[PDB]
Each structure stands twice: as structure tokens, then as C-alpha cells.
Amino acid sequence: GHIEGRHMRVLFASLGTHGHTYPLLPLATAARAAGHEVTFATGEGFAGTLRKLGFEPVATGMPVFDGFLAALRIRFDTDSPEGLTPEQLSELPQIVFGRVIPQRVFDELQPVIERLRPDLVVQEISNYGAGLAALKAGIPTICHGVGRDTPDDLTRSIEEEVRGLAQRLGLDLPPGRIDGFGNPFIDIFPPSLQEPEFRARPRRHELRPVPFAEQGDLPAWLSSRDTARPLVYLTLGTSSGGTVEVLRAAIDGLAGLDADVLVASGPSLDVSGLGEVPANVRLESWVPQAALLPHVDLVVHHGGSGTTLGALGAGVPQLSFPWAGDSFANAQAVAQAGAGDHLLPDNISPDSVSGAAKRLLAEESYRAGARAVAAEIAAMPGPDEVVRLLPGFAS
Ligand SMILES: Cc1cn([C@H]2C[C@H](O)[C@@H](COP(=O)(O)OP(=O)(O)O)O2)c(=O)[nH]c1=O
């Protein structure tokens, strides 16, 4: 038992992937420092990290792969994607994140919210199941964004599946876009790069896109490299951002440069077949990306929001290979700010990557564009400032 606005029970809830869980960590940490009790619901795999942050971890949802198996069965009556055209497979995402996962998360959070009786729920934008659970339980909720607003087909499809799931759960949602379930919205995307319409949205609040501070060690070789030549960082994320074929094409393109290349392949990408690489290319399974970026001269990636905002925050030029989800939205934002460039899925090769990487390194305008947003980001309200709003949200 606590008094109003002090030592609150705040329930953070996000999808079970790094790209969706990490963005909320800074605010959760700030909430704990403010004296609130943080319970964090997400993939069980994050349990260790959450506990170390002082949070009480809760396991929800399922691995993305398992989600696509479910959708695969629901939609195509099969256990394999084999024989299915990329157009048929592109019908699955809305089922996975609009129905299958939300259903699971809703089922698991209902009893959780029941016992925890949280004063406030911080719902990750794409974690609709958590939004529905809190809605039914009548808990004051705020929507925590992970990137740029995306008013595209993919998002609308996912939202309609969410609507269908809502109906079946006895929850009648308002007509029109989900729009964070009409709750206050925490926007971590650089306002200048944010969709104009969305930036005007009422009850919207800025929050600096702080990169998760992991206490891991940087690769030791950084301490003895030729710091007179560029350091290039290559990564395709942690969830379906790109393929190993694309990673191979990027390595061949970057390896030729007079530069050091650090590659982080992540937990999902199988690189057992990647093969041989020149000595200036180092392959890592995982790196403390937040601590790394300040040392980097160029970030080459899949276009994930976390790495996009990360590069922007560090004032580093970025080359992206947009293909999945909001990767295209982020590519537009980067182009708008002249903070980097991109190559389309049919234009990925050693040559195209090499040429683009050289341009982003040689021409100052790209770094200049990145430094501009880095300043804007630094001027945004920090987690400790925004956290002072939580009591008002709960009340
Ligand atoms: C591959 C890799 C990712 N990360 C983190 C940084 C980002 O916050 C997050 C990647 O998320 P993001 O860049 O949004 O792409 P996706 O959501 O497709 O994974 O994972 C590391 O910290 N170290 C690593 O080696």
C-alpha cells in the first residue's frame, strides 16, 4: 500500500524481441529510480536482463518463429512455408502481430493485471494484446512508441486483426485507426522527422530515444586497431531484418574499403554458412551496441528503429537495407534529414554497397545531417524528466 503518485506499481509490457523491449527500458529504469515498483512483461528470454535492472520480470507472448507457424496453419493449412510465393507469405504478419500474439499476451496479462493491480500500464505500441488487457481491466494506460509513425498498409492490416480480436473479446474499439487506444502517447522519434499529422496528435509527449545501456564489454580488438581509418559497423538486427546472403554481400562490399569492419549478426541470423572473411572484418555474435556507436564512422544495417535512432543519436551516417516492417519509414526519415542513404532489396551487392559506403564516408553532408538530429535528440526530454508525468497519467 502506497500513497498517490509515490512508489507506484507500473506495468511495462512489450513484444518479446529486442527491437520492441529495449526502447522501453530507459523509461522503466527512470521509473525505478523515482521509487516506483517496475514489473516488466515480455519474452522470458529477457528475464535475466530485467532482474538485473531491478525489475520484476513477467513472461508473455512467444518467439516470432512460433507466431508464423501458427499463422501459417491458420491461413494456409500447412506447417511449412515451402511452395508459398512471397506474396502469400506477406499475408501472415497481420495474423501474427494482429491476432496470434495479441491473443496470447492478452490471455497471460489478464490474470497478471488481476493480481498486480497496477496503478499504470506502459504499453509498447505494437503490443496490442497488452493494450486490450489493460483496457478491459480499466487500468490507466499510456502508449510507448518504438519508432516513427507508420500509416501504411501493413499497419492498417494489423490493426484490423486487432479490431477483430477486440470484438471477440467483448471489447468494442472506436472506429478508425487504433491510435494507441486513445491513450497518452510517448513518442521517442525525432519530432522533425516524425510524420507531421502524428506530431500534432493531442496528448503526445516527447521522450529522448535513449539506447539501452548494456554493461557488456566491447570487442578487445578495438583497443589496438588503426584509429586513423574509419570504423564501420554492420548489423541486420535481431529479427528477420535481413538475410545471410545480404550480410555476405555487405561484407564483400565493405571489406574492400580501407577500414575496420565490426559485424554483429545477432541471435536469430544463422551465419554458420557465412564463410571466410578478410582480417579487417571481425564477426561478433552480440555487442554492447550503445557503447560501440560513439566509436563508429558509419552504421550499415537493416533499417530497424533501434539502430536507426541509435546512429542518429550518435551523429553517425547510416546506410540501410530496408525490407522489413518500418525499415522503409526509417529510410525516408534518414533521407529527409540527409543523415544517410539506402539500397533497395534488388540493389544489394558488393559493388553497390562499396560505392554507397564510400560516399557516406567521404561526403561530409551525410555526417552533418546525422549530427543535426543528434543535437535534436539530445535536446529532447530525458527519461528522468518524462517520468515526472507518470503520476499524472495514473491519476
Ligand atoms: C545485433 C545486436 C543488436 N543489438 C540491439 C540494438 C537494438 O536496440 C536492437 C535491434 O533492434 P532494431 O535495430 O530495432 O532492429 P530489430 O528490431 O529488427 O532487431 O538490438 C545489440 O545491442 N547488440 C547487437 O549485437
Side-chain angles (χ1 to χ4, degrees), residues 18-19 22 233 235 237-239 264 266 286-287 289 302 304-307:
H18 295 82
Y22 276 11
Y233 177 49
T235 180
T238 68
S239 304
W286 184 265
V287 296
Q289 187 170 302
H302 55 304
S305 298
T307 300

Side-chain angles (χ1 to χ4, degrees), residues 17-235:
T17 68
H18 295 82
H20 289 260
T21 301
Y22 276 11
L24 277 64
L25 291 176
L27 187 64
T29 287
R32 179 179 175 271
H36 306 304
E37 302 185 6
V38 171
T39 294
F40 210 113
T42 191
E44 67 191 19
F46 294 96
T49 289
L50 297 173
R51 294 188 213 262
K52 190 182 182 183
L53 292 179
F55 306 157
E56 183 63 26
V58 169
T60 60
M62 66 182 70
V64 174
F65 171 81
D66 287 311
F68 276 99
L69 285 177
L72 218 36
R73 274 123 42 176
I74 298 178
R75 182 58 180 89
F76 299 111
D77 303 283
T78 182
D79 301 309
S80 171
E82 180 190 354
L84 294 178
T85 64
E87 300 73 64
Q88 296 172 290
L89 296 167
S90 294
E91 306 183 29
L92 302 181
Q94 50 254 67
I95 298 177
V96 177
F97 304 97
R99 183 197 307 181
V100 172
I101 289 186
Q103 175 68 79
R104 177 61 54 87
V105 174
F106 173 90
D107 284 334
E108 298 170 317
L109 284 180
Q110 190 161 239
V112 166
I113 296 182
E114 196 80 302
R115 302 178 179 181
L116 178 64
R117 63 185 188 270
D119 301 287
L120 182 68
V121 172
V122 180
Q123 171 226 321
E124 187 254 314
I125 179 181
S126 286
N127 195 8
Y128 304 101
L132 291 172
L135 173 55
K136 183 178 182 180
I139 311 293
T141 300
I142 62 176
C143 190
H144 196 307
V146 294
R148 199 189 200 200
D149 187 53
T150 57
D152 56 20
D153 285 32
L154 170 62
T155 295
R156 308 189 194 107
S157 301
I158 296 178
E159 291 188 359
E160 292 312 304
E161 283 284 343
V162 173
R163 187 189 305 278
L165 177 52
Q167 299 168 340
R168 303 188 297 268
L169 295 181
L171 307 168
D172 292 344
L173 299 172
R177 286 224 292 164
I178 297 295
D179 184 36
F181 296 101
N183 294 328
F185 195 99
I186 311 301
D187 188 9
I188 67 177
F189 207 78
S192 72
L193 304 182
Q194 183 62 276
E195 290 287 350
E197 281 202 35
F198 186 83
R199 193 177 63 230
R201 175 200 198 269
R203 302 216 290 177
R204 167 180 167 268
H205 303 269
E206 297 184 18
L207 173 56
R208 181 152 68 239
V210 178
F212 174 46
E214 171 183 322
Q215 291 283 343
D217 298 274
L218 293 171
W221 64 267
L222 298 178
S223 297
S224 64
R225 81 175 191 92
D226 175 24
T227 60
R229 69 175 176 178
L231 174 57
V232 177
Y233 177 49
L234 175 62
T235 180

Side-chain angles (χ1 to χ4, degrees), residues 193 312 332-340 365-366 368-370 372-373:
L193 304 182
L312 291 179
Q332 300 177 255
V334 167
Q336 175 176 335
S365 63
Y366 297 100
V373 188

Side-chain angles (χ1 to χ4, degrees), residues 268 303 393:
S268 295
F393 293 145

Side-chain angles (χ1 to χ4, degrees), residues 203-355:
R203 302 216 290 177
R204 167 180 167 268
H205 303 269
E206 297 184 18
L207 173 56
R208 181 152 68 239
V210 178
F212 174 46
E214 171 183 322
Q215 291 283 343
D217 298 274
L218 293 171
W221 64 267
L222 298 178
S223 297
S224 64
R225 81 175 191 92
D226 175 24
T227 60
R229 69 175 176 178
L231 174 57
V232 177
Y233 177 49
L234 175 62
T235 180
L236 295 188
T238 68
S239 304
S240 306
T243 62
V244 68
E245 283 79 9
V246 167
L247 193 76
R248 185 67 225 182
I251 294 178
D252 288 338
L254 300 175
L257 307 178
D258 183 24
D260 291 309
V261 183
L262 186 159
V263 182
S265 62
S268 295
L269 192 57
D270 178 16
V271 292
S272 58
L274 189 64
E276 175 182 344
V277 293
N280 57 318
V281 179
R282 290 75 158 186
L283 309 171
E284 310 291 346
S285 171
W286 184 265
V287 296
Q289 187 170 302
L292 167 74
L293 301 192
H295 309 271
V296 184
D297 300 288
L298 173 64
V299 179
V300 182
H301 65 125
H302 55 304
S305 298
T307 300
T308 294
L309 300 173
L312 291 179
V316 179
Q318 59 181 288
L319 174 63
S320 64
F321 308 142
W323 179 81
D326 58 11
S327 62
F328 286 99
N330 291 328
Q332 300 177 255
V334 167
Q336 175 176 335
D341 211 337
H342 58 273
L343 295 173
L344 295 173
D346 68 338
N347 193 17
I348 305 295
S349 68
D351 279 9
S352 65
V353 172
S354 171

